[PDB]
Point group: D2
Chain length 195, copies 4
């Protein structure tokens, strides 16, 4: 399974994610695309001669590649629709309020304005404070360490996203200061942190 931990950043909480049992795989083939599914849900695709269906010349998914594949599976007759939400998941947010977690003690529940909406995320970073601009890994974001941010819940209260630190953003070497990263007012709430 997977394990995420970060004392000074989020808190002295370990997060174990487990992949559940998987049934036998089924393969529905049509033309050059084979739809593979486990149970009733589709769990993947094997599209052949992909080179003549998409520009594939460390291949990383892009809104345009997904479009190409979507176009191909559709041309094959399948109706399933690939996740095509390429909205930035790492964004600049503003910490409106910070309050004590009702029953955690070293954790705070924050209300972070992220422009498109306001997120309630639980954070244990000792350096976080209201009035700060920070980068939040919204639900869906994929952490360098592997973990995928989900609509979690920390000891009772819901948490939708994570306040990032240098490490979280991908910094190779461990920084002297390990709390979360505080951006200058220069940054704009709602804007993507990455280009």
């Amino acid at each position: 399974m997977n394990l995420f931990y970060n004392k000074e950043a989020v808190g002295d909480v370990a997060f174990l994610q487990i992949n559940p049992t998987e049934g036998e795989y089924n393969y529905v083939t049509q033309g050059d695309v084979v739809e593979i599914q486990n149970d009733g849900e589709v769990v993947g695709y094997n599209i052949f001669n992909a080179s003549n269906k998409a520009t594939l010349t460390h291949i990383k998914l892009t809104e345009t590649l997904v479009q190409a594949f979507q176009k191909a599976i559709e041309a094959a007759g399948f109706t399933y629709k690939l996740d095509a939400d390429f909205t930035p998941k790492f964004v600049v947010g503003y910490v409106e309020t910070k309050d004590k977690h009702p029953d955690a003690d070293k954790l705070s529940v924050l209300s972070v304005d992220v422009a498109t909406e306001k997120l309630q995320i639980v954070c244990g970073a000792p350096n976080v404070e209201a009035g700060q601009k920070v980068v939040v890994a919204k639900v869906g974001a994929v952490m360098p360490s592997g973990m995928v941010i989900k609509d979690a819940e920390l000891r009772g209260v819901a948490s939708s996203g994570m306040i990032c630190s240098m490490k979280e953003l991908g910094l190779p070497n461990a920084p002297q200061e390990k709390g979360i990263m505080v951006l200058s007012d220069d940054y704009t709430v709602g804007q993507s942190f990455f280009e």
Copy 2:
């Protein structure tokens, strides 16, 4: 959603992996460990004050960490029993036979001896041949590019594992030769490729 493709080493086929949207999540809390489950299956754990339950000072799961966590969730009253498989997933294999794929043309179906068992994997690498010792990414292995090797099937015939190339093993720069990597007889079938 994961995407694998490597015209040179595997073949001109793109493997898309999808995780079917998980329903609601339920949280059963007892002491410092919260058992989280989706449907009836447990899908994870949030163990708090993990630092005083395990030695957590790029945290990667080890038989000993899992033991620590298992001891903690049990002490909390839960009966679920965490996984393991720490058996090496990248191993040295021997290509016993190589035959033409009944209906693929540029793909071959191989029978690879991996000591503990014999695997039938489909490979399109132009340089692969019978009599070669090679490194196979068995089912379960996690490819640097993200994808997780599964009990697949390529155009009809089953494929359990993947014959690796320099890139697949994690080589930073693209090598001149892009087929799969052929090891010298020095290597032992069944042994892990990594330390």
Copy 3:
């Protein structure tokens, strides 16, 4: 040779570093250590059976390894002394003053307090301002991109160090904001940026 360039963070200035060409190497051998020198200067060492002289089990020099090697070359009779400073080269600095470069136009000359001393560094980053706390790569620091910060000079005025940006500090993905990184007052002038 190597080439450094970072319009947005330092200025429209291409940095070419060049290694002059050496010649004849001489080898003075004593016991297990061979002192190699070019001209009259020592340019290296080959210490044999190093395993029984130091703990070498991506080997990176540490104050302690250098000590071990120093002890060995001395025990061999050589008097040369290895440079073992190890003082942090990436530190938090305070921008005291910012003035226009006498004849550059898009560059500013800054006076940065770095606790142990005050450094005059020339910077073209558009977002830098007096009153800001920033991380400076002092003379000697080794930039991820290869270049080694030296007691430079930009169009006339001397520059001892470089004001860093996300990229410079080792961030994998290009950030939306490309100027230099502005730290919060939380940071302490003179302290190392890295742990």
Copy 4:
């Protein structure tokens, strides 16, 4: 300084490369290019407004960039001529002969055919043998670990290059087999290992 050590691949010999303490730097300015030199040798260049002199939009030197810079420093009046060696440094070589090192015991002196020439390199890798095709890091090559291969000498006999192993070529994880890498006959002597 750098450090290199591969007990199993190269030998129980630690190589220290030392950066000879350079005195002052001198700056000769003409137009937009400043020629910087240490002693009498030129050690670099700072060409300003480089964007309007070359196409600079992880900047890595190319025969064309060097041409652009060369054209600029010349237009400024300087006569120095940029080096820039672009011949592959990591190549496929053939181990013609392998003999015992006259006085090292666990080292062998090899005669490696590299097509353009024959190199005498000293190697301690236990798995190396005559008749093998291997990848050699010729003089000039830059090892991932930092060190720069030079016209060395190991306990008496000269060594021009290094026989590489997985680690040396940049493999992230430590391999089970740590000797040098033996290529299949498929590889061609003299050809670059990297694309």
